[PDB]
Design a protein around this nucleic acid. Sequence first.
RNA 1: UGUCCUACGCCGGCAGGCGCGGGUAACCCGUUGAACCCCAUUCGUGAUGGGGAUCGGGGAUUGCAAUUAUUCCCC
Lengths: 189, 144, 130, 120, 72, 14, 122
Amino acid sequence: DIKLFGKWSTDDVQINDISLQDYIAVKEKYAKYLPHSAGRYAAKRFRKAQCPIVERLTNSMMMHGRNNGKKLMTVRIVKHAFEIIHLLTGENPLQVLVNAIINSGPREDSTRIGRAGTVRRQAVDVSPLRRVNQAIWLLCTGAREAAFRNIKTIAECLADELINAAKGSSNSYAIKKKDELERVAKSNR
Amino acid sequence: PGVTVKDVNQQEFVRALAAFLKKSGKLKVPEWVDTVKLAKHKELAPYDENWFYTRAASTARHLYLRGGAGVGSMTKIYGGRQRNGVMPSHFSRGSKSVARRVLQALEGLKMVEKDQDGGRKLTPQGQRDLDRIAGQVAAANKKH
Amino acid sequence: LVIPEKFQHILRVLNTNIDGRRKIAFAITAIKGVGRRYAHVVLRKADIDLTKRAGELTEDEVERVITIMQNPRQYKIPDWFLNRQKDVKDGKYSQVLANGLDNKLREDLERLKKIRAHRGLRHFWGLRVR
Amino acid sequence: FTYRGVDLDQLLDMSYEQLMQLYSARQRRRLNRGLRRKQHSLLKRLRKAKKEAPPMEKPEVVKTHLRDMIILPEMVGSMVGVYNGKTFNQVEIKPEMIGHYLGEFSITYKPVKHGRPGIG
Amino acid sequence: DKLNNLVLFDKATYDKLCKEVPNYKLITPAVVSERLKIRGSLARAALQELLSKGLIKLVSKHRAQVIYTRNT
Amino acid sequence: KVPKGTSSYQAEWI
Amino acid sequence: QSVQVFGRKKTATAVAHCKRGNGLIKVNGRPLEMIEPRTLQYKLLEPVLLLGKERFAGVDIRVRVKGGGHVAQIYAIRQSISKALVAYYQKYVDEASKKEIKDILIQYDRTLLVADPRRCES
RNA sequence: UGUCCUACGCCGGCAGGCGCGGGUAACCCGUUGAACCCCAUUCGUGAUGGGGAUCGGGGAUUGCAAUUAUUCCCC
């Protein structure tokens, strides 16, 4: 059976959210040995949803400038994070990954509607693919912000942010950013 | 018992060849081991006190892998980034005299011989020692 | 490792404070006149292992490495690592030390003044030399 | 006074070949490359100026444009006027400047005193 | 404020090292450097010391992250 | 104060 | 009795020489597991690990590899290995078996058979 | 890319010298033996060994001439 790095199962995962079920594609056919693929996913519209979500997480955390080309390094960081998530929580790392992505994704966004000069924003609904993208982006941004100047390690930082986002506590950067975004979206109307 | 060097993990093979240079004992060791740099592109001295036999192991194994190589060729192989200061960094070769006396001390033990072509390559005794040590590393890797 | 009972937290060498919790090479580097390279060479010639810490040292090792760093030529340190190769006055291969650096730059500045060269006058005005 | 462990009288009496190790690398390279005719005439003018002088009085200045010179030990006590492109300056050659050029004894540019700026 | 880390062990530090360490599930050099304010080199050296004692299992070793797990 | 022989171009430096 | 195919990726080309052998996959005189990018060593083993150990018992593949970098290099080597297996089971083995392994390979990753057509634009 | 591009050896910490060969060029440089990247060591969140300027000494090339640092090398 296909195992992530030859160790991680992919049949035990369950998707809580119906909205993100069709775009979080890791379950049966999309399970790969390595997150690295070097296959095209931005060639045409909606093709990046077919891409495994571990590859999305890999491609989204080397985004910062001085590490903008290193991808084997990135999947090594993802490996260390997944190991320490297993030895911390005990569950499968893909399950808690799916939970963090589901609970970190925003549901309503404020958007400028009108003209230049009217700063009054209107709250609009959120696409599920954009919800997945923003969840991964916020997780990666929290991983950066927790690992700037400390002994605390970047893979360990991604693990801590992922666990904090999945259990829903107000300690992940994604959770607090999503909560303030939701409350301002409610306040806009 | 048919094994070869390329079927042996390279870093452990270099380490074991350095250990063989220990328990062999004889090699022409310079009095400047504890003062010298190792390339003009490098900033500090090598951290390991016993770098000379490790570098000799790397030189011998690269000579086995590809022959017809001179001192300048090994100097080019051991190059890397010259941090040019605030200036943009470039590529720089290694130290000429260090690799030259490594080659001279390595042929001083009758492992390496001079080519008529102009280059320099390995003795049959050298390849016998190399695939013997490759045999020991293979035995210590496939059984551990 | 273990708890060293004879630990010197702050050292005083050549009228200079040394942080004893730092590594021996970089604690010796911390004083003026010697960097990491000459510290590594003087430590390799002093037969002292690099791993152990500055406060985790005995007094004989400290005084003997001071003795090595005082007179490099007698202890087989070759004549290209030295700070001043050929002095104007006596031309002696010697290390310069912390207060020695201040005094030697002061007298170099003074001789550049009294010669009235371009470099001395540029230092007098206080502008860029190179 | 003592230069590189050697006093002035020995340096004046020191022969021509062994100054090629008692100088800096730039001066040793320049002396290896060889001196040309103009400063050879300058050096002979220095000799004629130093012998044709009263013992108590200072020898007369010789004016020159050559700032390419390295200073030899024969030139101590000499009264040399050096051009900087506009005017000559009067320099007495002390013996502690022996490892220098004449070009640093005539600065070709004035120091900058910044005034109040105009419409920039 | 600056963070003060002791480079060498104390008696209370050694007591917390020999006893309070192997019930922390995850073991990194970073967490040992963080919880009781010691330098990372000292925490690492104590970590291979406890490994050579045979008291803590190793999960993986690398240049950046080296992860261990408490016994049984 | 000015030295004996120096020119005004160099006396501006002093 | 033997076939010679190639695998291209950007600039890197790896020529696979496939012969009825004794179950050895040799890449430039080195086996698959002892290629340097050990972080990306699973991609080189994906045909071998995914397709099983079973009918690779009598296949000797010698891969002579030139050009490219490291990632494009190992991708070219793995695509050459897959194409060598497809070509050998097309030529000397029945049609349905090679159709089956092609179906499995395309079902896993499309680049295992066809090369990436995009390259460095001037 | 090349009649200044360099192969090889020796003397060399080191820029570089010395004796020798090829190339007016898919041939010799040159399987152009690159660098990030990878794999092991040490450093461990502080103006730190990060970052390297600005200065002080020597050495070697380039050039009729390097002084107003040409350039590079060693502390």
